[PDB]
Structures are given as structure tokens and as C-alpha cells.
Paper text:
The incubation of IAPV virions at 63°C resulted in a mixed population of full and empty particles. Cryo-EM images of the full particles were used to calculate a single-particle reconstruction to a resolution of 3.3 Å. The structure of the heated IAPV virion is nearly identical to that of the native virus, with a root mean square deviation (RMSD) of C-α atoms from the icosahedral asymmetric units of 0.76 Å. This structural similarity indicates that IAPV does not form A particles before genome release. Whereas the capsid structures of the native and heated (63°C) IAPV virions were almost identical, there were differences in the distribution of the genomic RNA inside the particles. In heated IAPV virions, the RNA forms a 20-Å-thick shell with a higher density that tightly follows the inner face of the capsid and a sphere in the center of the virion with a radius of 80 Å. The changes in the distribution of RNA may facilitate the subsequent release of the genome from the IAPV virion.
Here we present a high-resolution cryo-EM analysis of IAPV virions induced to release their genomes in vitro.
Numbering used by the authors:
A (entry chain D): 13 to 69
B (entry chain A): 1 to 104
C (entry chain B), F (entry chain B): 11 to 257
D (entry chain C): 51 to 300
E (entry chain A): 157 to 208
G (entry chain B): 135 to 257
H (entry chain C): 51 to 100
Write the structure that this text describes.
């Protein structure tokens, strides 16, 4: 949905908040990136979880 | 017309032209092609802190023999933006471009 | 069709064309070259708008800046006398302003109604007053139409205190209203005011002291009044184009 | 709160002027008492005021050094090359309930009337009196000081350029002053309409404190436009001692 | 510039078998941030070394 | 209520009031005196209307009046050379006109855009030609933007006949079209044209002879061309108020 | 923190109450006392006008890098609180009447957690 | 507005007295300083001062 003649452009992006990005409105920090203590950081997700790669296998 | 200082601030805006957030977006489609919002993203771009860091052979050298000299200067972005703030958090990256007259 | 040029075309026998004043018979219609698809220039339309010519003339301008130190052995602190027995004992005034010939000259309004002939206007006036809370006083801002035209006995400066304040005016108390406004209408007997060939001093605007300036008797501290005057026009009609302008 | 957004950093106000408006100062003449630049505030995100520290190398030579007071919006624009922002100002009068006066704040776009000195740039109050520079056509605000104290002025971005330079007062003198004029596009001027009316039982001074911040900030290029690097001035211990001089050779 | 508690977070150590000379360029990683804002210090301009 | 006067009223603590540029804090609202029921003045609104300020600037003005007698030993009858081998053998032209600094000075347009700062405009141009039916000839009216700015080899006067007529222009045949029109766009790299502190000669307008004036060889009867030039502005935006004006 | 101000109506002035965390810890160029007027007032603070607000309040957060503040074995001067004059005290020139400002300071704690029992206390 | 009605003409106010009340003047005594007729205003439409 973005006009670009390169096939997939770069660095696949996540989502954030609902505001204007400058022009003072006290942007919350917890809303910007969406990784709390949960199954969303990949190293805590590998032991919650308990995949085989945390055991060396 | 009583006596006593007061309040009730009068925000006045000169030049009733057009809402500025439309004019900024229309000015960066023609002069930049990029829109720098946050100063945090300038901490992820590598800026050179020195140009000639001379060392000796077989000597374990900490980066705090260089970083402690160049934190005070404010040349790159991690030492210029650090004067606005009091804390930090997170790791750091480095690149070491070689400029040695090497032997084969 | 070709690009970036025009040729001889031999078009129709028409185009009596009007550029708002000028026409332009043109035995055949003139062949036009222009920008083929216009996307013109910079963002001057996004900065402000615009202005027009009867919206330029509605801008306030500084005209005078009065200061009254009390005092005073001078004349502007001398209040309205109760009677006028002869013409050498006229009513004393702080300041006079002939109109509309003061506001047309000042503030660059002379350029934006040059090369016109007739005018309607209402001279809006705003005074700005500012004194410390230990100084009292009252003033009166009346206007006398045709005051320098009529017979001397029909003037405002040749009548009593109860006759001066019977003119259209407004009180200016030092501790109740630091600003007064006043609309002075189209004060001319003829139709629209003639801008070329003549100064036409129609209405005079005076500022009278009812009471003297009531300051404390402590000298070397300057009890003071410090009035400022703003004027502009309203209900403006500016019609007939000429090539002349008055000296 | 995201304390690194350009909105949040540049929206931190800072005091650029503390003026002194006496009871002796004339009307329609800009208030020039105490601080440098007087009642002439260049509207713009970069920095316009600098001090010059002079120390000795030898008995026949002096090493000068330009020191610049930066607001937290002027400190961010020095990182970049071009800027574009809606500048905000809050003009506050420090007075009692018995000081009364009226004050005019008009905006005049374009080139600032300045006196280029051999080492610095100061303004020109001789060309901003009521005779030579009438404020009858400018956007102006006439502040009353009988009860009211503050006024917030939001000057938008008006220029014939899409962006203005962020060079400012850096290296500006008589020999070089082009980049100074192309950094601001305007100046606020504070002149009295009515002289300061005050009794004898109060002070003969008031102070005009001007706060400065910015809104709707966009910047262009992540390289400073200055000749030297961005260098933070570390104040030396004694007046006789020297500072750090950063080179440009690679 | 904290107290005498030292060595509370990690850093880098450099080693090379030969006497090298380099161009060091640093940046923060994907988790690096500042915080707890204060006001700015002063800046420094040119240094002309004038004739008198 | 009373008539023909005002008093001290002590009204509310409001009226940050705007006269389109000027505000006017006014600690309390100023007490107004005005005409109690307005029926103002003469019939200036019935004569014409009005005009505005971007409608004043759209008026055509005389700028130049060319006359070509053939003849001719002079230079304006010398046609376009096929080549330019050096800069001392440049293309000869009848007349040049720098723009927009010619049309802003002429016809009293300088007064009605004094005390502004920025401008957009399209310089409309109309030529008027008139010769007797026994005289033929053809001319070309090209315009070269930044002609006195660019390097000399990038000019219109330093190129061939086939390069001169490759510019945006129009033919002016003496016996097919007695008038041509041409719109010259906003020819400036920056946003709106700076009126104060600088002459900014952006686009040059030239008039070239393709063919010489083809009149009969009977002298003492004056075969003649007699061109006239009219210019005005269009798509006008005039935005920011200043107090300055250029010398 | 709460300041209490009280002056007569014939005296004007303005002050600024900024706080600088780690001000006696950092390098000298990173202090509040070694920066310009426009840099001092860029700190977190509040205006104290003599004739608009006779009292200001201010919450200074948990300004420590470590977890909960160590009460035993160490003075840990983390945040410094300063009071700066923006303008001088604008009193009348009549001496022997004492134009005067007379500020008072009140402080207390909030969001308190007090956890681990010991037998020791610092000297 | 009908500027000749007796209502409109007589409803135009005018200043008949500007007195001066000093800090020395006694109580319960009419204010007689400056103008003639003092603090005694004859209630009536005709004129009383000449």
C-alpha cells in the first residue's frame, strides 16, 4: 500500500499510538513500542513457552 | 478598573493563513523527502567521535580511555544530546574503521 | 498541435475585451501564448490573505500622543470656563484634529487612495489613556462639524461649558475607562468626499478638560496623564478612477 | 512522557530577555536598557546573541572565543541545517498593582536593522524610532498594564523560503553577516505607546521578561551548518586560562 | 559521574596485535535512550586569535 | 436612556478586539459613542464598485511605444543572424523589458503594493501593432527567464536564429495579427516575490525581427511599423505587511 | 516542596525555583550554576511572581538511579534545589522603611515505601 | 432618529456644575467652592445662572 518500485522496501515495521508525532501533546512511552513483560520479546517468549532451544537442543 | 494584578492569558496568533501542520507536510515533500520527528532516532545513526585514534601493539585498551575524553566535547549526537538529559539506559554500538599503514 | 510557441492564425473579427477599465477593440482576436497547464508558483496564498483596498483603510494608525503634566502653568490643563464673554476668552482645548484630512495623510493611507476621485468613510476614533491610580480627572471628546466653516458664534470654542458638552461626545474618566471609541459619520453635505482638488476640512475633533488633572502635590514625581490617539475609516466606497492627485 | 520528541524538547520555555522599562524612556522607541538586543527579539528558532571571551596567548596577541546562550529550542536547531517552526513568545511584565502603562509588540518581517561590529552583531535602535519606523502597517498587539500582565504571541512561519538556515549568530560580524539575516524572517519590537505611569511610592522600574519556545517544528538535514563542530562550552576555572579548540582536519 | 560504586555495567575493551590507528563511530543500540530532561548548557563559536 | 452623549460606565473586563491587524487589549471594554441609527452619506455606492487591490493591479498600462521606419541604417531593423560566432556579434533585438520590475514601477502600481512584502503575479503582456497594408514583416516576441543571471552561453542573445525562436514566444505578422497576448508565469525559484530590499530581475522579455520591414522603396512617405506595449498582472497574492519600501 | 511568599503591594519581583538532579555529582560544565540565564530557566521549575502567586508547590520525584534510597551507611545527596532571582527586588527608593520579600519553605514526603528492618543508623 | 422631538432635544445632557469638595470643608454645609450657585442646584427646566 506504499508506492515504491523496489520490491519490499526495508525493515518491517510495528505499530504505535494515535496522535500527531510532533506538536506538544505529551506522547506516552509505553504506547510507542508494544513489548511489555509478555509473549512479545522472544526471549521471555522462549521460556513461558519453553521451546527446545533454551535447553541447548 | 479595580487595583490588583491579574491573569487570563491572551494567546494571539498573527497571520491567519492556513493550519501549519498542512504547510509543514507540504514543505517536506519538496525539500527533504524525510521527516525527523524524534531525537531518539539520532542516537541510532553512527557519527564519528574521532578521526585518528592511535594505539600501541599488544595493549588492552578500554574505550573509556577515549569516551571519557569525548563525552565532554559534545561533537557527536550521544555527547551533544546528553547535556539535555540526566539518565540513560541501553547498550551502545561501535565501528572501528581501519586507517593503518599495514604490512603484508 | 505544436508546443511552446504560437503562429499567425487569422481568427475571427471579435474580442472587444475588457481588463476591468481598458478595452481593447482588436479588429481580430489576438493569438494567445500562455503556460499550457498552470501550477503557478510559491505558497503566498498559504501565508495570509490578502488584503483588499477597503480593508487596508480600516487599519488603525498613531496620529497624536498627548502628555499632560500637572502642574500646570500651560493651557491644556486649563478646564472649560463657564462662560465666554468675548472671542479672546475662547474655550481652551487639549488638542484639535481636523477630519478626514488627518487620517488620510497619516499611516500610508495616501498611497492607497491616490488615483481615485470620490470617497465615503466614517472616521473611527479610539483614545487610549493610562494614568497611575493616584491621579484623577475627567475629559470630554466632542466633535463639531463645520466648526471652521460656520460663523464664529456658531462654533464650539465660542460657547459656554454647558454648550460645549451638549455636542456629540463621550466622557473620559481617568479611573473608570482607559479607552473610549467614537464613530464620526459621513459629515459632508455633498455626495462622496472629493479627494482631488481641495482640502475639505468638514468635521473638527476636539478634546476638552472638564476638571483639571487631580494629582498629588508631591513634585519631582510627575503626576501625568499620557493620552494616545488611534483613527481609521469604515463604511468605505472608493469609486471613480482619475490620473490626478492633490498637492 | 517521551522526553526526546522534538515537540517536547522545543516546547520547553526559556527566558531570553529581562528588560528594564524606566519611567524616563521615551514613547515609540524600543526598550533598550540592561541586556543586549534591547526590545528587538529576532523571531526564529536559532540563536542570535553571543558573548566574546578574550584571553591572552602572548603580550601582543589575544585569543577570542564566542560563547552562545542557548534555549532548549536553540540548542536543537544547532544540530541541523535548516528549520521551519511556529515560534511562540510570552511577554510578561514584572510590576506592582500601581504601575500602569501601555506596550506595543509589532512584527516586522525580513532583514533586521543591525549594527555589525568588528566581532559581533548588535541591533540598531536609531532606525526603529517612531519617526523613521512607523508601526501603522505591522501586525501589532497593544498590551494594557493596569491589571493584565502576560500575553502569548504565536508567530507562524512566514518567508519566501521553504526553510530558513540554522546558522544564526555563529561567526557573524561585519565581514560576514549574510547567514544571520537568512535565519529568522522577522523581529518582534517592543515599544511603549504610553510612557510608564508610576507613583513615587513604588519603584521607578518594571521588568519585561520574555519567554521563548516553539511549536510545529520541522528540521531538514542532520548536519550542522556551522563552520566548526557543535562544541559545548565548558567554562574554565580562572579567567586567565584557556578552552578546548576542536580542529577540522581529518 | 556517580559515587565510588564502580563497575556496575559493562563496556568494551579493545585489543590488536599491531599498532593501529582508527576512526571510531558510536551509536546506541535498539534499546538505547536518554531521559529525565534538564535545560541546555552554553555553546562555543569560533576562535579567531585577533591581532591585538 | 440619554441621547447624543456617553458617560463612564465601568463595563466588563474583556474586548481583546481586532481591527484586522491591530489588537487592542483594553482592560475593560471601551464605551462607544456612534450615530444612533445610521443612514450614512452620498451615493458613492451607486456610481461604481469598488475596486479592490488585486483588481487595481490588473489594469493595463503603457510601457513602451516602438516606431520602426524602414529604412534602416539603425539596429532595430537588423534581423536575426543565422549564427553567433562571438559575443561581439550577439543577436540584435528591437527592445528588451526586464520583468516584473518594469510593470511594478509604471502606471502607479508602486503605491498600491507599498507596505507589503511578498507577491505572486503573472505578467500579462499585450502588443498592439498597426501598419498600412503596403508594408509586410514578421517579428517574434520570446521571453528568456534568468537571461541576465545565467552564464553568457546560456543566454538568448548568444544563440543562433533557430535557437532564439525555440524559446516560448509568438509570431507577430504585420498583416495577419495586429495584436498578440502572452502570459508569463511566476518565474521565480523561491516562494512569493520579495518586494522590499532588492530588485529581482527574473525574466527578460525580448522582441526580435525575423524578417526586415518590407516597405516600398518610395522615400519621403515613411513606411512604418509603430508597435505599442501593454502589461498588467494576474493571479495576484499580496500577503505580509511591513513598514519598509525599497529605494 | 511548598514556598510561602509575602510582600507588601508596593514591591515587585520575580524568582525561579528550579531543581538540578545530581548537580554536585556531575562534571562542572553539566551543572546549573555553570550555565547561562536561558539554560538555568530551562530546568524543571516554577515562576514565583511577588504579586501573582504568594505560594508555589512542586513535586520532586524519586531521583535515584538505584532501587529504594539507602538510609544506612551514606549521605546520598541526589537532587539539589535552588532558588534564583530572575529580576531584582523592585522596591521604592524610600529608605528606613524596609522593602522586603520574606520567603518561607515547607517540605514533606509522598509516595512512601519503607521496607527492610535493620539495627543500624548512620552517624 | 427624529432629531427635533422635544423628547430627543431635552434628553441631551449637559454639565451645569463642576464643584470642588476639599478635605477642609465642614460637614452639613453646602459645597460652595469654585463655581457660582455652589452645591445648590435649582430643580427646573429654565436657566438660573447668568
Amino acid at each position: 500500500t506504499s508506492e515504491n518500485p523496489k520490491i519490499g522496501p526495508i525493515s518491517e515495521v510495528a505499530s504505535g499510538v494515535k496522535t500527531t508525532a510532533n506538536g506538544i501533546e505529551r506522547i506516552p512511552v509505553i504506547g510507542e513500542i508494544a513489548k511489555p513483560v509478555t509473549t512479545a520479546v522472544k526471549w521471555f517468549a522462549d521460556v513461558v513457552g519453553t521451546v527446545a532451544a533454551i535447553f541447548g537442543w | 478598573i479595580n487595583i490588583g494584578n491579574k491573569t487570563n492569558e491572551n494567546v494571539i496568533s498573527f497571520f491567519d493563513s492556513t493550519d501549519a501542520e498542512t504547510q509543514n507536510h507540504n514543505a517536506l515533500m519538496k525539500g527533504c523527502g524525510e521527516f525527523i520527528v524524534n531525537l531518539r532516532t539520532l542516537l541510532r545513526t553512527f557519527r564519528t567521535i574521532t578521526d585518528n585514534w592511535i594505539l600501541q601493539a599488544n595493549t588492552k585498551t578500554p574505550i573509556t580511555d577515549l569516551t571519557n575524553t569525548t563525552d565532554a566535547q559534545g561533537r557527536d549526537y550521544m555527547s551533544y544530546l546528553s547535556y539535555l538529559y540526566r539518565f540513560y539506559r541501553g547498550g551502545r554500538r561501535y565501528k572501528f574503521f581501519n586507517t593503518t599503514p599495514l604490512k603484508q | 498541435n505544436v508546443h511552446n510557441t504560437e503562429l499567425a492564425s487569422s481568427t475571427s473579427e471579435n474580442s472587444v475585451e475588457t481588463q476591468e477599465i481598458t478595452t481593447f477593440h482588436d479588429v481580430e482576436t489576438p493569438n494567445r501564448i500562455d503556460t499550457p497547464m498552470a501550477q503557478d508558483t510559491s505558497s503566498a496564498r498559504n501565508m495570509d490573505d490578502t488584503h483588499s483596498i477597503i480593508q487596508f483603510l480600516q487599519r488603525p494608525v498613531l496620529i497624536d500622543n498627548i502628555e499632560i503634566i500637572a502642574g500646570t502653568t500651560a493651557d491644556a490643563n486649563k478646564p472649560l470656563s463657564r462662560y465666554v464673554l468675548d472671542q479672546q476668552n475662547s474655550q481652551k482645548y487639549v488638542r484639535s484634529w481636523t477630519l478626514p484630512s488627518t487620517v488620510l495623510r497619516a499611516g500610508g493611507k495616501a498611497q492607497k487612495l491616490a488615483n481615485f476621485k470620490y470617497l465615503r468613510c466614517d472616521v473611527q476614533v479610539k483614545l487610549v489613556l493610562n494614568a497611575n491610580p493616584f491621579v484623577a480627572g475627567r475629559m470630554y471628546l466632542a466633535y463639531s462639524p463645520y466648526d471652521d466653516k460656520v460663523d464664529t458664534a456658531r462654533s464650539v470654542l465660542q460657547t459656554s461649558r454647558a454648550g460645549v458638552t451638549g455636542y456629540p461626545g463621550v466622557e473620559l474618566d481617568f479611573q473608570l475607562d482607559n479607552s473610549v471609541e467614537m464613530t464620526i459619520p459621513y459629515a459632508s453635505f455633498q455626495e462622496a468626499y472629493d479627494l482631488v482638488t481641495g482640502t475639505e476640512d468638514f468635521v473638527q475633533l476636539y478634546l476638552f478638560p472638564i476638571t483639571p488633572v487631580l494629582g498629588p502635590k508631591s513634585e519631582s514625581e510627575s503626576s501625568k496623564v499620557d493620552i494616545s490617539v488611534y483613527m481609521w475609516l469604515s463604511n468605505i466606497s472608493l469609486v471613480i478612477p482619475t490620473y490626478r492627485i492633490n498637492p | 512522557v517521551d522526553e526526546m520528541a522534538i515537540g517536547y524538547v522545543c516546547g520547553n520555555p526559556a527566558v531570553k530577555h529581562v528588560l528594564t522599562w524606566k519611567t524616563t524612556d521615551a514613547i515609540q522607541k524600543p526598550i533598550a536598557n540592561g541586556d543586549d538586543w534591547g526590545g528587538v527579539i529576532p523571531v526564529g528558532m536559532p540563536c542570535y546573541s553571543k558573548s566574546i571571551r578574550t584571553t591572552r596567548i602572548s603580550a601582543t596577541e589575544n585569543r577570542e572565543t564566542e560563547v552562545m546562550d542557548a534555549a532548549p529550542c536553540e540548542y536543537v536547531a544547532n544540530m541541523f541545517s535548516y528549520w521551519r517552526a511556529t515560534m511562540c513568545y510570552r511577554i510578561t511584565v514584572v510590576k506592582t498593582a500601581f504601575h500602569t502603562g501601555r506596550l506595543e509588540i509589532f512584527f516586522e518581517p525580513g532583514v533586521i536593522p543591525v549594527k555589525p561590529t568588528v566581532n559581533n552583531i548588535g541591533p540598531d535602535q536609531d532606525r526603529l524610532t517612531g519617526a523613521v519606523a512607523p508601526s501603522d502597517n505591522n501586525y501589532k498587539y497593544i498590551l494594557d498594564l493596569t491589571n493584565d500582565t502576560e500575553v502569548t504571541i504565536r508567530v507562524p512561519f512566514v518567508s519566501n523560503k521553504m526553510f530558513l538556515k540554522t546558522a544564526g549568530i555563529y561567526g557573524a560580524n561585519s565581514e560576514n553577516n549574510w547567514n544571520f539575516h537568512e535565519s529568522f524572517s522577522g523581529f518582534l519590537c517592543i515599544r511603549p505607546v504610553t510612557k510608564l505611569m508610576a507613583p513615587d511610592t513604588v519603584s521607578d522600574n518594571v521588568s519585561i521578561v520574555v519567554w521563548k519556545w516553539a511549536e510545529d517544528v520541522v528540521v531538514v538535514e542532520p548536519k550542522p551548518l556551522t563552520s566548526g563542530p557543535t562544541q559545548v562550552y565548558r567554562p574554565p576555572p580562572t579567567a586567565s586560562t584557556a578552552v578546548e579548540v576542536l580542529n577540522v582536519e581529518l | 559521574a556517580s559515587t565510588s560504586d564502580k563497575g556496575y555495567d559493562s563496556s568494551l575493551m579493545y585489543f590488536s596485535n599491531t599498532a593501529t590507528t582508527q576512526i571510531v563511530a558510536r551509536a546506541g543500540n535498539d534499546d538505547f535512550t536518554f531521559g529525565w530532561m534538564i535545560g541546555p548548557p552554553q555553546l562555543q563559536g569560533e576562535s579567531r586569535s585577533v591581532a591585538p
